[PDB]
Amino acid sequence: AAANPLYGRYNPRLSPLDNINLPAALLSRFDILFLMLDIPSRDDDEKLAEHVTYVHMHNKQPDLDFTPVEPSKMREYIAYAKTKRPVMSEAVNDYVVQAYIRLRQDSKREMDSKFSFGQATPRTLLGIIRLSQALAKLRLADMVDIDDVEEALRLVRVSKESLYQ
C-alpha cells in the first residue's frame, strides 16, 4: 500500500497517530510501515540529481561494479526459494522472545508520549518470525539462524528512524 499523510507532507508537531489518519487496528495488520518521507539536504540531493539526469540522458543505469539482474531470472530464483520451509533454532527462539519483551516493555512503559506510536503486539512477533523465515529462504537455508532475526528487527525499527531526521 502507498498512502499519504493528512497534509500530503508530514507535520513534525503532530504525533504519528494524529499525523497518520489510519486507525491503529488496521495499521497493526501492516507488519511493516515505512515513514518514507523527504527532508532537503545539501549533499544527498546531488547524487539523486545525478542518477535521474543520467537515467534521463539515456536508458542505462549507473556504471557501478554491479549489474541489475534481469527480472525473469530473479523470478526463477524466487520460485525456487518459495519451495523452502525453514525451521527455527531454539537458540533464536529464546532470543526472539527476550527481544520482544524488551520491545513491548519499552513500547508500552516508555513510548506513549511525543513521537511514540502504537503498541507492540503478538502480531509483530509473528511478523519477525515470517521475516526471519523469508531471510532464511533467500539464503536457500533449511534452518533459521540467530543471524536472521537481528536483521529482521533492524528493518522493523529502521522504517521509523527516518522520523528523527
Binding site: 486507525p23 491503529a24 487496528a25 497493526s28 520451509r85 525451521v87 527455527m88 531454539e90 527462539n93 526472539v96 522472545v97 520482544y100 519483551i101 513491548r104 516493555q105 508500552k108 503498541q119 507492540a120 503486539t121 503478538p122 502480531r123 512477533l125 509473528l126 518470525i129
Partner: protein
C-alpha cells in the same frame, strides 16, 4: 470367458469374487492399509439388517482396496458403477439367501424372494470438485464435500406409463426403457385395430420421486484463480428430504453429462453439454463436527422411519464410548479440561473459552404446548484490544459447528441475512433462497466487525437476538420463519486499542440496549506484562519448532473427536431442570446488579443450565449458579470500575 462390451467386467467372476470377500473380511485394513479383536466384519452387519428391514447396505469402499483379492474390483466399481452396482444388487440377494439356507429359520423367504437390495458406496478418494472432472471422468464414481444453498420441489418422473383406448375396453401399460415411452400406434390389434386412436392417461401411471439440489462446493484445495461453483445435482427416491439448506456434507454419486434443449419449439440440442451428479450416497455427518439439534429436527427423525431409509441423521456411539464418557464426567476438572481442549493453540483466555463452551451446549429449550417457546442459548460479544483470539475463535466455532455463515462487516446486509427472491437462470423462474440467518437455523451464526455493520442492517439482529425468529412482508412472501441461531460477535472499541479513562458503555460505541440484549459481553483488554507475554511467545514459537505441531499433545487435552462425541451426547440427552431451591441465590445476584435488566436473569438461567448440561446433570444444584454469575461479572471485570 464372458465380457461386457466396452468393459472389463465378467459377471460370474466378479460375482464369486465379491462373495469370497463378503464371506471373509476382518478389518485387514488395520493390518495392511497403513501403520495402524473383531471377526466376520460384514456378516454381523448383514444379519443385523434383515430383522430391521433397512434394505440399504452402506459400504466402506476402502475395505476392498486393502483386501488381498478385490483390488481387481475397486477400480471397476469406481469406473463402471452403473453396471458393477447392478451386479451387487443380485449377488447380495443370493448372499442373503445363503444365510437363509444354512439356517433353520422362520419365513423370511416369502418377501426377500421379491424385495430388492442395493449398495451405497461412499468412502472413495478426494477430488478437486467440479474442476478436475475432465470428460475422461464422465460416468464414474465421484465424491464432493460442500454445502446446500437451495433444493427444488419433488418432481414426478415416469416409471410405468399407462395407455387408455378410446374404444373396445382394453388399456395398455409399458415400462420405460432408457428415457423413452414407445407408444403403440396399433390398438393391440388382436382385440381389433384402429390405426391411431389410443390415449395416454396421466393419473393411472406410476412415478418415481425425483428431487434436485444446489450444492455450493468447497474443495480441500482450490487453485489460485478459482471462485465458488454452484453445482446442480439430482437425488432419487429414499434420498429426497435427506439433506437440506445449510447442511455441510460429503456426497457421492456418478458424474454425468446431458444435453439441453435450445428452446421449447424444436429438438435442436446444445452441443456444449451440461453436467451434474446423480447422487448414490450422502454422508450426513462427520466425526469432527457436532450433531444437529435433535429437538429442532424431530420432524425428520420419524420421517426417516416413515420413508423407510436409514441414511443416518445422528452419530452412533457404542457402550465402550459411553462408558468412557461417564468415567470422564466424574473428574473434578472437566470444567477446565474442555476449556483447554476447545482450543489447544489459544493461550489463557479461559473465561472466554468456557462461556463459548456453554454456548455450544445451548442449555435448555422449552415450549408451552401451543402458546409459547423459549430456547437455550447465549449470545456473545468480544470487545477490547486487537491482536487477540477474536478472529481465530470465530473460525474454530465455524469449523466445529455443523451450521453457520461467517458474515462480515458492510459486506452483509438485510436482503442477504434474511431471505431474498431471485431468478434461477437454469430454468428462468423466480425462486426463494434462504439467507444467511435462515441457513443458520441452528448452531452458530458468527459475526465480525460487528460495529462496522451499518445502522440499517443491525436492526434485524435487534429482533433475532432473543426472539429467535424473523418476520417478513415483501412481494411474493408473507411469513414468519425460524431463526434458531445462537449469535456470536467480534467488536472493537471507539477509536482504537482501548482507553480505560472512558466508561466502557461509551467506549464500545454500541447502543446501551443492544449491548444489554447480549447475554454475555467479554472485555479482553491486553494490559501488558512480562511473565504472561513471554509464556505466550514460547507457546507460539513451539508451533514453528516442528513444522507441523504434532507435539501439541503436550499439556494434556482431549481428542477433539471425543469432545464432539461428548457434547453431541450431553446436548442430545439431558434436559436440566432449574430446581425451585436455586431461586434464592439467583434473585439476589440479579438484585445485586440492580443496586442492567432481566436479560441478565434470562441469561443466567440459560447459562447455568448449560453448566448442568456439562457434568450431565438432570437437575441444577445451588453451586452451578455460583460459577455462572462470577463468569458474567468477571467477563466485564466488574470489580475494577
Amino acid at each position: 470367458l464372458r465380457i461386457i462390451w466396452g468393459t472389463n467386467v465378467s459377471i460370474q467372476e466378479c460375482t464369486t469374487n465379491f462373495r469370497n470377500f463378503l464371506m471373509s473380511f476382518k478389518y485387514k485394513f488395520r493390518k495392511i492399509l497403513d501403520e495402524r479383536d473383531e471377526e466376520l466384519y460384514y456378516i454381523k452387519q448383514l444379519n443385523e439388517m434383515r430383522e430391521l428391514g433397512t434394505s440399504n447396505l452402506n459400504l466402506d469402499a476402502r475395505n476392498l482396496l486393502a483386501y488381498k483379492q478385490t483390488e481387481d474390483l475397486y477400480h471397476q466399481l469406481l469406473n463402471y458403477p452403473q453396471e458393477v452396482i447392478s451386479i451387487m444388487d443380485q449377488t447380495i440377494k443370493d448372499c442373503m439367501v445363503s444365510l437363509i439356507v444354512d439356517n433353520n429359520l422362520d419365513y423370511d423367504l416369502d418377501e426377500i424372494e421379491t424385495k430388492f437390495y442395493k449398495v451405497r458406496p461412499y468412502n472413495v478418494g478426494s477430488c478437486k470438485g467440479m474442476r478436475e472432472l475432465n470428460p475422461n471422468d464422465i460416468d464414474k464414481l465421484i465424491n464432493l464435500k460442500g454445502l446446500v444453498l437451495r433444493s427444488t420441489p419433488v418432481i414426478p418422473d415416469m416409471k410405468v406409463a399407462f395407455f387408455k383406448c378410446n374404444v373396445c375396453d382394453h388399456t395398455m401399460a409399458v415400462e420405460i426403457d432408457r428415457g423413452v415411452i414407445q407408444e403403440p400406434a396399433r390398438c393391440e390389434r388382436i382385440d381389433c385395430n384402429e390405426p391411431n386412436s389410443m390415449s395416454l392417461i396421466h393419473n393411472r401411471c406410476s412415478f418415481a420421486d425425483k428431487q434436485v439440489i444446489k450444492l455450493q462446493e468447497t474443495p480441500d484445495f482450490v487453485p489460485d484463480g478459482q471462485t465458488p461453483h454452484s453445482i446442480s445435482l439430482c437425488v432419487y427416491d429414499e434420498l429426497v428430504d435427506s439433506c437440506r439448506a445449510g447442511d455441510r456434507i460429503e456426497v457421492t454419486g456418478t458424474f454425468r453429462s446431458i444435453p439441453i434443449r435450445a428452446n421449447s419449439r424444436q429438438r435442436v440440442l446444445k452441443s456444449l453439454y451440461k453436467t451434474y451428479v446423480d447422487v448414490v450416497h450422502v454422508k450426513k455427518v462427520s466425526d469432527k463436527r457436532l450433531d444437529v439439534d435433535t429437538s429442532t429436527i424431530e420432524q425428520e427423525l420419524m420421517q426417516n422411519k416413515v420413508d423407510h431409509n436409514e441414511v443416518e441423521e445422528v452419530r452412533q456411539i457404542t457402550d465402550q464410548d459411553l462408558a468412557k464418557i461417564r468415567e470422564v464426567a466424574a473428574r473434578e476438572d472437566l470444567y477446565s479440561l474442555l476449556a483447554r481442549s476447545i482450543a489447544p493453540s489459544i493461550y489463557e483466555l479461559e473465561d472466554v473459552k468456557k462461556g463459548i463452551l456453554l454456548q455450544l451446549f445451548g442449555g435448555t429449550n422449552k415450549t408451552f404446548t401451543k402458546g409459547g417457546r423459549y430456547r437455550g442459548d447465549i449470545n456473545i460479544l468480544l470487545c477490547g484490544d486487537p491482536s487477540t483470539s477474536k478472529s481465530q475463535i470465530l473460525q474454530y466455532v465455524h469449523k466445529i459447528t455443523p451450521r453457520g455463515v461467517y458474515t462480515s462487516g458492510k459486506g452483509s446486509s438485510a436482503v442477504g441475512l434474511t431471505a431474498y427472491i431471485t431468478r434461477d437462470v437454469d430454468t428462468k423462474q423466480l425462486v426463494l433462497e434462504s439467507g444467511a440467518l435462515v441457513l443458520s437455523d441452528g448452531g452458530v451464526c458468527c459475526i465480525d466487525e460487528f460495529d462496522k455493520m451499518s445502522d440499517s442492517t443491525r436492526s434485524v439482529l435487534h429482533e433475532v437476538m432473543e426472539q429467535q425468529t424473523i418476520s417478513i412482508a415483501k412481494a411474493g412472501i408473507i411469513t414468519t420463519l425460524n431463526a434458531r441461531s445462537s449469535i456470536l460477535a467480534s467488536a472493537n472499541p471507539i477509536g482504537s486499542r482501548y482507553n480505560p479513562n472512558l466508561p466502557v458503555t461509551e467506549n464500545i460505541d454500541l447502543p446501551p440496549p443492544l449491548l444489554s440484549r447480549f447475554d454475555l459481553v467479554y472485555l479482553v483488554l491486553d494490559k501488558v506484562d512480562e511473565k504472561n507475554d513471554r509464556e505466550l511467545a514460547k507457546h507460539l514459537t513451539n508451533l514453528y519448532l516442528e513444522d507441523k505441531p504434532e507435539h501439541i499433545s503436550q499439556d494434556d487435552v482431549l481428542p477433539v473427536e471425543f469432545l464432539t462425541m461428548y457434547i453431541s451426547y450431553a446436548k442430545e440427552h439431558i434436559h436440566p431442570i432449574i430446581t425451585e431451591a436455586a431461586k434464592t441465590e439467583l434473585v439476589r445476584a440479579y438484585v445485586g446488579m440492580r443496586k442492567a435488566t432481566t436479560r441478565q436473569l434470562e441469561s443466567m438461567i440459560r447459562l447455568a443450565e448449560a453448566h448442568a448440561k456439562m457434568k450431565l446433570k438432570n437437575v441444577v444444584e445451588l453451586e452451578d449458579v455460583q460459577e455462572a454469575v462470577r463468569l458474567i461479572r468477571s467477563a466485564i471485570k466488574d470489580y475494577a470500575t
